[PDB]
Motif scaffolding. Structure first.
Motif, PDB file in Angstrom:
ATOM      1  N   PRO D  46       0.812  -1.221   0.000  1.00 26.43           N
ATOM      2  CA  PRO D  46       0.000   0.000   0.000  1.00 26.43           C
ATOM      3  C   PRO D  46       0.841   1.264   0.000  1.00 26.43           C
ATOM      4  N   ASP D  47       2.146   1.128   0.238  1.00 24.06           N
ATOM      5  CA  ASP D  47       3.021   2.291   0.249  1.00 24.06           C
ATOM      6  C   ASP D  47       3.231   2.862  -1.144  1.00 24.06           C
ATOM      7  N   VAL D  48       3.064   2.041  -2.182  1.00 21.81           N
ATOM      8  CA  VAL D  48       3.230   2.501  -3.554  1.00 21.81           C
ATOM      9  C   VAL D  48       2.108   3.424  -3.999  1.00 21.81           C
ATOM     10  N   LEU D  49       1.016   3.495  -3.241  1.00 25.54           N
ATOM     11  CA  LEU D  49      -0.128   4.317  -3.604  1.00 25.54           C
ATOM     12  C   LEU D  49      -0.466   5.386  -2.575  1.00 25.54           C
ATOM     13  N   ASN D  50       0.212   5.413  -1.429  1.00 30.42           N
ATOM     14  CA  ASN D  50      -0.127   6.351  -0.364  1.00 30.42           C
ATOM     15  C   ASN D  50       0.071   7.810  -0.749  1.00 30.42           C
ATOM     16  N   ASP D  51       0.578   8.100  -1.946  1.00 28.86           N
ATOM     17  CA  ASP D  51       0.713   9.478  -2.400  1.00 28.86           C
ATOM     18  C   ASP D  51       0.312   9.615  -3.862  1.00 28.86           C
ATOM     19  N   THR D  52      -0.645   8.808  -4.314  1.00 30.17           N
ATOM     20  CA  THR D  52      -1.052   8.783  -5.717  1.00 30.17           C
ATOM     21  C   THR D  52      -2.573   8.866  -5.797  1.00 30.17           C
ATOM     22  N   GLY D  53      -3.082  10.055  -6.111  1.00 34.60           N
ATOM     23  CA  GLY D  53      -4.486  10.204  -6.432  1.00 34.60           C
ATOM     24  C   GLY D  53      -5.406   9.988  -5.243  1.00 34.60           C
ATOM     25  N   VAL D  54      -6.607   9.489  -5.545  1.00 33.94           N
ATOM     26  CA  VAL D  54      -7.645   9.348  -4.529  1.00 33.94           C
ATOM     27  C   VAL D  54      -7.206   8.377  -3.442  1.00 33.94           C
ATOM     28  N   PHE D  55      -6.532   7.290  -3.831  1.00 32.50           N
ATOM     29  CA  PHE D  55      -6.067   6.314  -2.851  1.00 32.50           C
ATOM     30  C   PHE D  55      -5.109   6.941  -1.847  1.00 32.50           C
ATOM     31  N   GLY D  56      -4.403   8.002  -2.243  1.00 35.20           N
ATOM     32  CA  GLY D  56      -3.562   8.721  -1.305  1.00 35.20           C
ATOM     33  C   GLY D  56      -4.333   9.604  -0.349  1.00 35.20           C
ATOM     34  N   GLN D  57      -5.586   9.919  -0.672  1.00 35.92           N
ATOM     35  CA  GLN D  57      -6.450  10.662   0.236  1.00 35.92           C
ATOM     36  C   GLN D  57      -7.224   9.738   1.162  1.00 35.92           C
ATOM     37  N   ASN D  58      -7.646   8.577   0.662  1.00 31.70           N
ATOM     38  CA  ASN D  58      -8.379   7.637   1.496  1.00 31.70           C
ATOM     39  C   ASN D  58      -7.476   6.913   2.483  1.00 31.70           C
ATOM     40  N   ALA D  59      -6.182   6.805   2.190  1.00 29.60           N
ATOM     41  CA  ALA D  59      -5.261   6.101   3.072  1.00 29.60           C
ATOM     42  C   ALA D  59      -4.736   6.996   4.187  1.00 29.60           C
ATOM     43  N   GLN D  60      -4.238   8.183   3.839  1.00 24.82           N
ATOM     44  CA  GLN D  60      -3.668   9.064   4.852  1.00 24.82           C
ATOM     45  C   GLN D  60      -4.740   9.606   5.786  1.00 24.82           C
ATOM     46  N   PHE D  61      -5.880  10.013   5.242  1.00 24.53           N
ATOM     47  CA  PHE D  61      -6.968  10.553   6.055  1.00 24.53           C
ATOM     48  C   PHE D  61      -7.902   9.451   6.542  1.00 24.53           C
ATOM     49  N   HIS D  62      -7.338   8.460   7.226  1.00 29.89           N
ATOM     50  CA  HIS D  62      -8.106   7.354   7.783  1.00 29.89           C
ATOM     51  C   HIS D  62      -7.264   6.685   8.862  1.00 29.89           C
ATOM     52  N   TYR D  63      -7.804   5.607   9.427  1.00 30.17           N
ATOM     53  CA  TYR D  63      -7.138   4.886  10.503  1.00 30.17           C
ATOM     54  C   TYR D  63      -7.070   3.383  10.294  1.00 30.17           C
ATOM     55  N   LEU D  64      -7.960   2.797   9.499  1.00 27.34           N
ATOM     56  CA  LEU D  64      -7.952   1.373   9.212  1.00 27.34           C
ATOM     57  C   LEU D  64      -8.135   1.171   7.717  1.00 27.34           C
ATOM     58  N   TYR D  65      -7.686   0.020   7.226  1.00 24.09           N
ATOM     59  CA  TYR D  65      -7.634  -0.187   5.787  1.00 24.09           C
ATOM     60  C   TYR D  65      -7.412  -1.662   5.490  1.00 24.09           C
ATOM     61  N   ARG D  66      -7.999  -2.118   4.386  1.00 25.11           N
ATOM     62  CA  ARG D  66      -7.763  -3.458   3.867  1.00 25.11           C
ATOM     63  C   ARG D  66      -8.178  -3.483   2.405  1.00 25.11           C
ATOM     64  N   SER D  67      -7.354  -4.106   1.564  1.00 29.68           N
ATOM     65  CA  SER D  67      -7.673  -4.207   0.147  1.00 29.68           C
ATOM     66  C   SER D  67      -6.720  -5.186  -0.514  1.00 29.68           C
ATOM     67  N   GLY D  68      -7.215  -5.853  -1.550  1.00 34.58           N
ATOM     68  CA  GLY D  68      -6.367  -6.616  -2.435  1.00 34.58           C
ATOM     69  C   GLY D  68      -5.741  -5.723  -3.485  1.00 34.58           C
ATOM     70  N   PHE D  69      -5.125  -6.361  -4.476  1.00 29.76           N
ATOM     71  CA  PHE D  69      -4.505  -5.623  -5.566  1.00 29.76           C
ATOM     72  C   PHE D  69      -4.540  -6.470  -6.828  1.00 29.76           C
ATOM     73  N   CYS D  70      -4.222  -5.831  -7.948  1.00 30.09           N
ATOM     74  CA  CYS D  70      -4.215  -6.456  -9.267  1.00 30.09           C
ATOM     75  C   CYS D  70      -2.949  -6.071 -10.017  1.00 30.09           C
ATOM     76  N   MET D  71      -1.803  -6.238  -9.358  1.00 31.09           N
ATOM     77  CA  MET D  71      -0.517  -5.924  -9.968  1.00 31.09           C
ATOM     78  C   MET D  71      -0.400  -6.569 -11.343  1.00 31.09           C
ATOM     79  N   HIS D  72       0.078  -5.789 -12.309  1.00 36.89           N
ATOM     80  CA  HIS D  72       0.113  -6.220 -13.703  1.00 36.89           C
ATOM     81  C   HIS D  72       1.334  -5.593 -14.358  1.00 36.89           C
ATOM     82  N   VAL D  73       2.332  -6.412 -14.674  1.00 37.85           N
ATOM     83  CA  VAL D  73       3.603  -5.947 -15.215  1.00 37.85           C
ATOM     84  C   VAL D  73       3.670  -6.291 -16.695  1.00 37.85           C
ATOM     85  N   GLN D  74       4.142  -5.340 -17.500  1.00 36.35           N
ATOM     86  CA  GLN D  74       4.304  -5.532 -18.933  1.00 36.35           C
ATOM     87  C   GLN D  74       5.637  -4.945 -19.370  1.00 36.35           C
ATOM     88  N   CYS D  75       6.265  -5.593 -20.350  1.00 38.86           N
ATOM     89  CA  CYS D  75       7.572  -5.184 -20.857  1.00 38.86           C
ATOM     90  C   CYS D  75       7.472  -4.980 -22.361  1.00 38.86           C
TER      91      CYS D  75
END
Lengths: 106, 219, 214, 207, 48, 214, 207, 219
Positions: D46-75
């Motif tokens: 979750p540290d990769v998103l704590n300063d990116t867009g809306v997810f950076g507002q919902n994470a910092q301005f809160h106290y609890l959190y849980r979520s999966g992810f859909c990491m997708h790498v392309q070369c």
């Protein structure tokens, strides 16, 4: 450094003889010892890599071999353009030391 | 059952026992159990997962480059590329496999293994390789035409980029198989293409693997 | 099968710490506190560090005796300071009487005392690897929800007895359930509580002469 | 070919702010040049998103959190390029220092949305060996067959909810096993792209 | 159940235990229980 | 009948070895390792060498005491090194802690400890006669699949105690099943682990004066 | 009158190369002259065939093996000849030395297809006494009644499969109890013939 | 069953007991049981198997020649050939029989035996022998015509080459039978035929044999 050194500092043979230059390593260096041939004044070409395999262009007269701690190089019949310097190089010991020389005569 | 005589073995403490004991905190209600994903209830299910073999384990070769088998261009036909014994639990290339470590936490084992090979060269690079397996009885074959009369699988990595060599049986109770990779054809490439690729081997254990007599390891 | 399972892989209770009740010479303590620690010996650590989350209750046995193997009649008190109770600080201390700290009063010349500590953790299971900082450098990866308590051991006496008592704590893991398997540690353990390794990397597999030699 | 980690889609904890496709969008981070000398990268969960867009507002301005992810790498690699990546998601990826000073710097344990290049990828920077990293959820990126790797990761933690700015659940490592190679006259830096998409996220304890 | 061996943990006294003991005054009939108003059986009901 | 069966013929646990924990004088060991051996005494050997293949689990009892029959409170550790685990090498040695080697912590002044070793063999049953060479002169007829383990015994101490402890290992054969009966050994046993006899043959039957005399 | 050892025909282990009548033929070894001074002979079970025909190719070029046998001894004796043989099959026949140097020579423990003459047949060369050898499967050869002895032997071993060039299961001993006798003017060496026929053989681990 | 008092016999170790003990390796799964041919579950079934008696046990006679009874030509009629007591468990010719050894691993026994005789002479050789058995009460008979009035079996080895002499009963609790072989007729042979043969005796125990009070042996 492992300090792999060649025993014959200078040798002399005939145009049909079979020279046998060695390079006695101290520590375990594995099959990571190369041979670099140096012209009288020009650059230094490569002969053997990984102690056994000829290069892409080296003639058939040259050949490498391994025997315990006595990595060596042996020329088939000592044709012309051979009475030059020789070196043994290993890239196992990270200081990457060298040997001495085997400038051949006749 | 009022009169009893104490049979021998009393007041003894046997470590490997399943006795009972009084709870030092009765009434205590521990934190309940919520569903955490990814529970493993057997080390066999951990062995059957493929991991890399340090097949290039050689004096001098350091770093991640020990997991790579060099397949190059100017390696003439019928030459030898690599070889490694099939012994998950003896010091060698298997010592970096999940099987090669768990099998060092036990005393005896027997089952079938598998060695999936993976070519990591250019798409334009074509060729062919011979992968032969030798039972524990014989020794390492000396020539390519000597291993073709065995239990091999010819591998055209230009067409199919990954194969599997299933070992029939490897039992350790008291002389182990050998797998050799022979240069069947040359390594042909079109212009403007690298002439040195790598093979990556992955080892595992088939669903018939068994372990016995758990014991400590030698790190 | 049935001998490679995770329930059997952690059985066969082993020594988790050798504590000593120093009472003679220049160490007239008369008591000793041993913080319950599972990852005390590398052998057990490397096994426990195979999984990420684990849930288990433990049975503790105390094989105590003097320093010449003789077991006199001397009485001993094994007090279990729970996770979050103040620990004793002297032979004669108020903490030795608190009825919330269960005690076991057995003698040296008796079958080793054997209690059963339950699963004492705020979270759902123990966490050997906790990526993150607690207390929302000397704090990275230190989970405080893995403390199981303290075992304070003293000889019930008035003045100094003059006999050192060596105790060998034995722990058995029961009802174990493990989650999220991890690769087995390859490098050495340079320091406790941290995964710190050393610069000189040690290759996992032994090095042979050539790639084509068996 | 989406490797569903441990066979569990991320789900909503049964009955907190439950965001929607506004936050469940596709965050496309910066690309990273994959060279021959490259060792690897890793991004915390979750540290990769704590300063990116809306997810950076919902994470910092809160106290609890849980979520999966859909990491997708392309070369975006050519056809004359060769190499291989190992894209693995490591639950509770704990970084370790390397004494010849004892504890990892904060820049190395929470690299941000740029990732931290490995200093010793052979040991995953965590003592454990890279050869056994395949026991984690993973997918190979072999430029001769495919140049894509999608990993679906549920929420793996002991407590139901946890902090988002302190405890980073996992770390997406990307390590080149077979180094990149190419003949003269090619793009000397294959680009690697990473796309993230929070799945079934939740939040609590506002401000 | 005539032959038995004493498993470890014998002759030990564990304070937090729910063992049994002999009544030091058998036959004794304690004062009966009359209904006293205001019984609390949980500290939670005191916290609330 | 029912008293000549093979199950009863091998009952009545007997002494299989007298090991001694030398700890005083010029033998300050403090420990001793006894390799589990059934064919230790000729009497038991000749009986076990009646069958070829046999399968049985054993119960081991340790009747230990000092050299003047007194049983003090001294604590003892009986560690069972399994078949294929490194054996200890000193009083203070890492091997004494390995949780894979089950230990029994009993005192001299306690009922003799009694454990039950299972059938520990790779093959289906023990092989007292193995015609053939292992490791595909000092190797003929040596089967390595008959090793049952090792029993290492030490007094749990710090410095030398100064008291020799004599232990008498008693083994009982349970659940025994025998295969392929063989003639009972007639010649002496010139050496252990081999069937080697001596040149001077000893006639099985005693020699009388004439064939026609009783 | 075929003594079926322990009442068990050799059978195929239920479900390896399973040979046929090509290998399941009748190997007729060389004959041995039975004289008056003769003490006896013994042949190991699979060692007697490890260099004879197809069975010598299937045994050496393999790793596992199991098979019964059909040992069959015949003595072409006259009617004025007298004597008696004891033909017994000894499972796990272990030879012993005789100290006045401690271990048996290899020629005495694997004699080949020629057999090794006993040096002390009274003790079966194995310490055990010959008088009790009848507890093994056996058949008498008494020249006054019959001159044939057929023994059917199953596969007797602990493991299902085992090596064929290292572990020799049993040994066919042939010992004359009542020595041969004849008046002047007779064949002074009664010939003894031995026929072998592997039954239900199997093999595994080629080369 | 909470309050108990320890009746006498506590903390004692009785070797010949069938007590219980904790398994020192729980969870361990020993090697399974495959069918090995030839299991014997009783020493009686081993006794009932015929083995040779060293009937010729005599000072000087060495080697295998102790198992042979010499039956020759110039042994006039009514002469004595051999004699041996019926005592499986006393030092004598029975000491080399599977019964003669097992009966030394016990204290008391009682049952019926059998002594199968086997002639090993030429096929042309004919004759007759008298085989008489004497109960424990009497002593060895002195003459052939004194043993014919007993419990005998006349043996014409020219016709039938093997007989059996079943002993009715031999009990050892606190004076044993005797078996004698008498030259009934001469030993007649045609020309060109050896004039010296051998008799081989084999002893066993009938299906009524019993053993009691197992004990160690005296080698």
């Amino acid at each position: 450094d492992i300090q792999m050194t060649q025993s014959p500092s200078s040798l002399s043979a005939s145009l049909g003889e079979r020279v046998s230059l060695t390079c006695r390593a101290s520590q375990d260096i594995g099959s990571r010892l190369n041979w670099l041939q140096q012209e009288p004044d020009g650059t230094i070409k490569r002969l053997i890599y990984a102690t056994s395999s000829l290069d892409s262009g080296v003639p058939k007269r040259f050949s490498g071999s391994r025997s315990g701690s006595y990595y060596s190089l042996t020329i088939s019949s000592l044709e012309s353009e051979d009475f030059v310097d020789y070196y043994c190089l290993q890239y196992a010991g990270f200081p990457w030391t060298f040997g001495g020389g085997t400038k051949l005569e006749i | 059952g009022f009169p009893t005589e104490l049979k021998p073995g009393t007041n003894q403490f046997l470590t490997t026992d399943d006795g009972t004991s009084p709870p030092i905190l009765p009434g205590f209600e521990p934190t309940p159990l919520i569903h955490i994903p990814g529970e493993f209830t057997s080390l066999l299910d951990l062995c059957q997962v493929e991991t890399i073999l340090e097949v290039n384990n050689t004096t001098g070769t350091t770093g991640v480059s020990r997991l790579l088998i060099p397949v190059r261009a100017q390696n003439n036909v019928d030459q030898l590329c690599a070889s490694f014994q099939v012994d998950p639990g003896r010091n060698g290339p298997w010592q970096s496999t999940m099987v090669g470590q768990i099998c060092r936490y036990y005393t005896q084992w027997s089952g079938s293994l598998k060695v999936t090979f993976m070519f990591t060269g250019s798409f334009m690079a074509t060729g062919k390789m011979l992968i032969a397996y030798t039972p524990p009885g014989s020794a390492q074959p000396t020539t390519r035409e000597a291993a073709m009369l065995g239990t091999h699988i010819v591998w055209d990595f230009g067409l199919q980029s990954s194969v599997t060599l299933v070992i029939p049986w490897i039992s350790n109770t008291h002389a182990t198989g050998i797998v050799t990779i022979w240069y069947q054809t040359n390594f042909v490439v079109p212009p403007d293409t690298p002439t040195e690729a790598n093979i990556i081997a992955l080892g595992a254990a088939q669903k018939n693997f068994t372990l016995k007599l758990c014991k400590d390891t030698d790190e | 099968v049935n001998e490679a399972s995770v329930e059997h892989f952690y059985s066969r209770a082993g020594l988790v710490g050798v504590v000593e009740v120093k009472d003679s010479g220049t160490s007239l303590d008369g008591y000793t506190v041993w913080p319950i620690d599972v990852m005390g010996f590398v052998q057990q650590r490397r096994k426990l560090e195979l999984s990420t989350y684990m849930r288990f209750d433990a049975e503790f046995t105390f094989v105590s005796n003097l320093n010449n193997s003789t077991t006199p009649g001397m009485l001993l008190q094994y007090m279990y300071v729970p996770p979050g109770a103040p620990k004793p600080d002297s032979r004669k201390s108020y903490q030795w009487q608190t009825a919330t700290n269960p005690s076991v009063f057995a003698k040296l010349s008796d079958p080793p005392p054997q209690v059963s500590v339950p699963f004492m953790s705020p979270a759902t299971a123990y966490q050997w690897f906790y990526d993150g900082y607690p207390t929302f450098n000397l704090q990275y990866g230190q989970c405080p929800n893995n403390m199981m308590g303290h075992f304070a051991i003293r000889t019930v006496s008035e003045s100094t007895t003059g006999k050192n008592i060596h105790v060998r704590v034995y722990m058995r893991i029961k009802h174990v359930r493990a989650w999220v398997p991890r690769p087995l540690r390859s490098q050495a353990y340079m320091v406790k509580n941290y995964p710190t390794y050393s610069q000189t990397i040690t290759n996992t597999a032994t090095d042979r002469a050539s790639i084509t030699t068996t | 070919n989406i490797v569903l980690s441990y066979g569990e889609w991320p789900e909503y904890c049964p009955s907190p702010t439950r965001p929607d496709v506004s936050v469940n969008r596709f965050y496309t981070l910066s690309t990273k040049s994959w060279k021959t000398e490259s060792t690897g990268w890793y991004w915390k969960f979750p540290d990769v998103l704590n300063d990116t867009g809306v997810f950076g507002q919902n994470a910092q301005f809160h106290y609890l959190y849980r979520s999966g992810f859909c990491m997708h790498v392309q070369c975006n690699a050519s056809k004359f390029h060769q190499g291989a990546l190992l894209v693995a998601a490591i639950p509770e990826f704990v970084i370790a220092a390397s004494s010849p000073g004892l504890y990892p710097d904060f820049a190395h344990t929470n690299p941000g949305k740029d990732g931290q290049e490995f200093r010793d990828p052979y040991v995953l920077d965590a003592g454990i060996p890279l050869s056994q990293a395949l026991i984690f959820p993973h997918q190979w990126i072999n430029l001769r067959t495919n140049n894509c790797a999608t990993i679906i990761m549920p929420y793996i933690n002991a407590l139901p909810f946890d902090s988002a700015l302190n405890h980073s659940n996992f770390g997406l490592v990307v390590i080149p096993i077979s180094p990149l190679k190419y003949c003269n006259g090619a793009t000397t830096e294959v680009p690697i792209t990473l796309t993230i998409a929070p799945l079934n996220s939740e939040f609590s304890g506002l401000r």
